[model samples]
Target: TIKVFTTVDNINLHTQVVDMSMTYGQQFGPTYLDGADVTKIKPHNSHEGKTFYVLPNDDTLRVEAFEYYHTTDPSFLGRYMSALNHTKKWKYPQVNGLTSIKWADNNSYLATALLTLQQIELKFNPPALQDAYYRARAGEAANFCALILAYCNKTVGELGDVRETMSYLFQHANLDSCKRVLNVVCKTCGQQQTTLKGVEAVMYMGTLSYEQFKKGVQIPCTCGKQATKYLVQQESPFVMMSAPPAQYELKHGTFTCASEYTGNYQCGHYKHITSKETLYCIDGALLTKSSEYKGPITDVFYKENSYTTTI
Candidate 1:
């Protein structure tokens, strides 16, 4: 037999819930109650948005039934479980209910649960995530679950009704290694390319461009500067150098050529050696390689030289 009750003024509720959970196992239900103002009842888990139940008590039982029925009775109970897991406090029921769920043989579910918990780790506890990241990188990290739940206390404090995309880039994300390659714009030279820096920088890169990221995230520009906001606030003294070379126009144009004669004047081959006249003219400044010049040539030059050769 299993039963659960909710009251605003019971110090023993915490132990009682745990006791009921241990005794009844799958038959236990979560307790829900509203505090009456008559007694100024400071609840055990007294915070805004907290359900009227003690820690790990009501939660353990709820998750057991959820796991048991999610496969068979997915019609109503599945939706209920998903809604219950969506809450900020209980959103990661796997963290608290790890004991209830089968962790040994069922690997796929455990993987899903681990990844779900990782999103919270990435969002709220980045430093710990980094520590976990580097440890995994070193290949010394044995327990993935150990690394995650060790810092669970810090994560449960401030996650009240926050909603954002779960995956880093629409896939399972672990900050252990930076795999994204991006064309980073350099502050000093204009543009260059490099891999993303791991941590919050990598996590945000999927949804943000370098322009927008520069404004919000603390990543170093490709120019190798550690400061982004500092550099953004200061004007580049070298802007004059980076600016395209000032526009210039052709002031004048000239043409000159030298032709040599090898054969005697008697032969037509000597005529082939005669001076070949070629001309070049300058158009206006608006003319460019990309810009087509369909207009007729405006400037033309003609030069004549007279000479006598004896045969």
Candidate 2:
């Protein structure tokens, strides 16, 4: 019959505490030691008025059931347990995604690079450590692209293919190698794209309202064979708020009206006096104009009727 052993048990014919002070520095030392015929702890001489001597070990074998003492064969279960509890010397790689980002000079480049990358619909996951590193690296790469474009006196929009341009730059240069070239580009040409009046118009005759002019004007730039328009958006509280009520009803006040009236108090119809309605004290059936009189204070003001806007 054949049997398999699952648990390990130590068999002892005779047990003796072997003194290893001559070789090992401490009891039950760590695994792996080198050098032989060396005393780790030297023999002490007389101490406390007593002398110690080395004793001879018994060389005779008296074991009855001992069959083997493993020399080369490793302990299978022991090896697994050792591996499980062993202190691992972990290896970390330094060159990673964010490595190039360290070379970036400013957040502006970072922003531009990120947007340029996103323009190509490049796939990316956010918030993860590795993903963040990748984004940072991508931005730095874009900044490199900017440098290359500036060197060529061109804009990024002129590129035939963004990915190809990026790949070419990356193939030729690393993040740190282009510092001198970047500084040269910045000092010489400045930014490749600059703001200019994009739209050309005649306006023919009448003055253009400030709001209307702001709404349609475009600041364009040239990139290779194509023209790109950057719409300059201007926000005005005057344009945003609802138009003021066209007509403001008149209150109890003595006002002069230029329009012809059948009443006892009326002025001749004149350009200067036109549209001004005067409220007389006698019209309100009161002695004083300050009396509570709710009526048309003046002519109703219409938005389209007047060429210019009133406050």
Candidate 3:
């Protein structure tokens, strides 16, 4: 037989009470801390307080206490508690289907509800609810796939892999389809769809859909390579190296100016020439000096001279 000995001692540890103060300075922004006002209180008193602090005791418990105390002000606790209950229920094997299809279906519905709640929480309060909601959604999808696999007498892992792969393919296919639809709309509608305002609105919606698709499937380049590859792959060495194209006339005097003034050449001619000159202008005189030419010259000449110079 083994004998165990135990000793007890009476002692109290003396600790200093730490006073932490969070001061709002110019750097931290005045919204939360009004130019020296303390938005939060902590146990450490430093010149520039930490953005977040770790308490000696359980900080979560402290936050909960604060929330409960302030609960009467019509806040997010009710919805938060509902979300918590759903999350707790989701974790249990009894609540989730462990052996039957009905259980799996129930979990799926629960997951959909959880996803909705999560979106709502994102709009209102997101600190804790966001993680809880997403975790529930993932679990729901996993469980739903597991149930289907079980019904078919297959392994859950195989079913999950297949489901994930199908989801990925479907999302990419949908994006390709959407791009095709927009192109068709633009071609059929002509100027009606191609106006600055119209195109801007379409682009905004398309961008949002692309973003959601990216988040859902976790893929890069949502516009589908077939649609954007041409634009991206179009490499003009002229643009990259800041080189401009040479101006060539169709005929010696065939270039009739579009402007009303006959004495003055069209601004387009000067603009095109200036662009080409600027592209090739790389000398130190252009960068360091205010004027390219020091001699007396007409305003138009000065303008052209200034435009051709570059940094």
lDDT of each: 0.26, 0.23, 0.22
lDDT of 1 by residue, 1-311 (tens): 12344322222233233232232222223333321121123324323333343213344444543342222222332222222232211211222222112222212222233323332233223333444445433432222333232222112112211002222221223443333333444467665444432432233322112233334334576467633331122111100001111221211212111111123231211000001222211111111121221221111111212211121
TM per prediction: 0.20, 0.13, 0.19
Which of 1 and 2 is ahead in TM-score? 1
> For residue 50, what is the lDDT in candidate 3?
24
Model 1: residues with Cα > 4 Å off, grouped in runs: 1-157, 160-177, 186-188, 197-202, 205-311
Query: Which ranges in model 3 have alpha carbons more than 4 Å from their true place?
Result: 1-75, 92-107, 112-125, 133-181, 184-188, 191-311
How well does candidate 3 match the true structure in TM-score terms? 0.19
Error of 2 at 202 (Å): 23
TM-score of 1: 0.20
Query: Per-residue lDDT of 75-193 in model 3, one digit per residue for the tens?
Result: 22222222323333333221221111122212332222222222221221221222333444454433223222222233321212212222222221212211211111122222111
Task: Please give, for residues 1-311, the per-residue lDDT of candidate 2 as tens digits.
Answer: 11111111122222223243333224212111111111244323211122111111222221111121111223321232232122111111112111222221222222222323322222221112123335345432332333333322333223222222333333322222111000011322333422221111101011112333323223232332322222132211111111111222333222222111121222211011111133322211112233233432222111111112121
Report the Cα lDDT for residue 95, model 1: 22
Model 2 spans with C-alpha error above 4 angstroms: 1-103, 120-215, 218-311
